[PDB]
Curated annotation (Swiss-Prot), chain A:
Post-translation changes: Palmitoylated; structural requirement for proper assembly of the hydrophobic core of the lipoprotein particle.
Record note on quaternary structure: Interacts with PCSK9. Interacts with MTTP. Interacts with AUP1. Interacts with CIDEB.
Recorded disease: Hypobetalipoproteinemia, familial, 1: A disorder of lipid metabolism characterized by less than 5th percentile age- and sex-specific levels of low density lipoproteins, and dietary fat malabsorption. Clinical presentation may vary from no symptoms to severe gastrointestinal and neurological dysfunction similar to abetalipoproteinemia. Hypercholesterolemia, familial, 2: A form of hypercholesterolemia, a disorder of lipoprotein metabolism characterized by elevated serum low-density lipoprotein (LDL) cholesterol levels, which result in excess deposition of cholesterol in tissues and leads to xanthelasma, xanthomas, accelerated atherosclerosis and increased risk of premature coronary heart disease. FHCL2 inheritance is autosomal dominant.
Species the sequence originates in: Homo sapiens
Protein name stated in the entry: Apolipoprotein B-100
Location of this fragment in the whole protein: 4516 to 4563 of 4563
Annotated function: Apolipoprotein B is a major protein constituent of chylomicrons (apo B-48), LDL (apo B-100) and VLDL (apo B-100). Apo B-100 functions as a recognition signal for the cellular binding and internalization of LDL particles by the apoB/E receptor.
Compartments (UniProt record): Cytoplasm; Secreted; Lipid droplet
Listed transmembrane segments: none
């Protein structure tokens, strides 16, 4: 049962991160204010 | 533009292990509402 | 006669440096409850700065612990030196921890035969800084899976500053798989451990002791049941 729980955790974690990245990209497209945010798969860069 | 980006955000995200976006549920509810409207009496071109 | 334990401590001052010696041991009728622990540390305060060297080693049936520390202490915020820990456990897995700190870099990692090698390195500088959190697979110590990474960069041109945060889903998934695979590894060692102690003392397994308890329960149940049946005949006869 421990191994099954960890398997499901990995599965949903992976299935979830891609949707999060897509939503983040769509949100970042909203604004172009002076502090510029660059989003990448598995990475985020912040310029201040 | 704001409504467009909000629609993009809604379309692009859903919970893991399900690939049906919430916009289909919204369209289903809109279809039900339109069916009720056409059922309703006192129809007007403004309803169309 | 059954139990003898000795705790010996001594603090000594020798001109320029202090020396701390600690000893502790126990003699027991129990085999796995006897040991000897020892530590030695020489402490020299040179014109206010401290130079520290200490060794702590433990001995026991189920493992032995060996730790080395060296370094110096300038002020309350500048310790430069190395710390190395090595564990030899027949009872469970072994481990080897290495900690390093220089004025411009901190590096440390732990090599576990079950998880692998988990380490983190901090390179610090005025105009840049980078934090690296990596997991090297147990099956591949030659590469580092970046669990996370931070990169601060203050631009020397203009007033801009960059923050770059990076992570690997691969590292997290591999570590999760290693952890879920490690469950039986701990379970078996602990099970054999408890059975080993049961053997050392009464010669029985945990399952053997469970079976003995069940058998004794059954025996006592019959002992009660026979008398419960007999009392009926006793009462009937006396009534007649």
């Amino acid at each position: 049962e421990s191994k099954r729980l960890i398997d499901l955790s990995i599965q949903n974690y992976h299935t979830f991160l891609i949707y999060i990245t897509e939503l983040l990209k769509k949100l970042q497209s909203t604004t172009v204010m002076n502090p510029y945010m660059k989003l990448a798969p598995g990475e985020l860069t912040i310029i201040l | 533009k704001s409504l467009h980006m909000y629609a993009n955000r809604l379309l692009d995200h859903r919970v893991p292990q399900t690939d049906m976006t919430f916009r289909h549920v919204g369209s289903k509810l809109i279809v039900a509402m339109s069916s009720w409207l056409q059922k309703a009496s006192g129809s007007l071109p403004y309803t169309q | 006669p059954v139990y003898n334990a000795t705790w010996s401590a001594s603090l000594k001052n020798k001109a320029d440096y202090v020396e701390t010696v600690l000893d502790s041991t126990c003699s027991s009728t129990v085999q796995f409850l006897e040991y000897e622990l020892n530590v030695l540390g020489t402490h020299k305060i040179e014109d206010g700065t401290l130079a520290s060297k200490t060794k702590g080693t433990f001995a026991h049936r189920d493992f032995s612990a060996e730790y080395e520390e060296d370094g110096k202490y300038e002020g309350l915020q500048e310790w430069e030196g190395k710390a190395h820990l090595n564990i030899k456990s027949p009872a469970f897995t072994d481990l080897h921890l290495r900690y390093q700190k220089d004025k411009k870099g901190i590096s440390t990692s732990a090599a576990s035969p079950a998880v692998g090698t988990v380490g983190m390195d901090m390179d610090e500088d005025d105009d840049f800084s980078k934090w690296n959190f990596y997991y090297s697979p147990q099956s591949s110590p030659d590469k580092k899976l970046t669990i996370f990474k931070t990169e601060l960069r203050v631009r020397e041109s203009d007033e801009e500053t960059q923050i770059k945060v990076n992570w690997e889903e691969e590292a997290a998934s591999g570590l999760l798989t290693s952890l879920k695979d490690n469950v039986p590894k701990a379970t078996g060692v602990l099970y054999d451990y408890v059975n080993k102690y049961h053997w050392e003392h009464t010669g029985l397994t945990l399952r053997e002791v469970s079976s003995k308890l069940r058998r004794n329960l059954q025996n006592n149940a019959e002992w009660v049941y026979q008398g419960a049946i007999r009392q009926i005949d006793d009462i009937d006869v006396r009534f007649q």
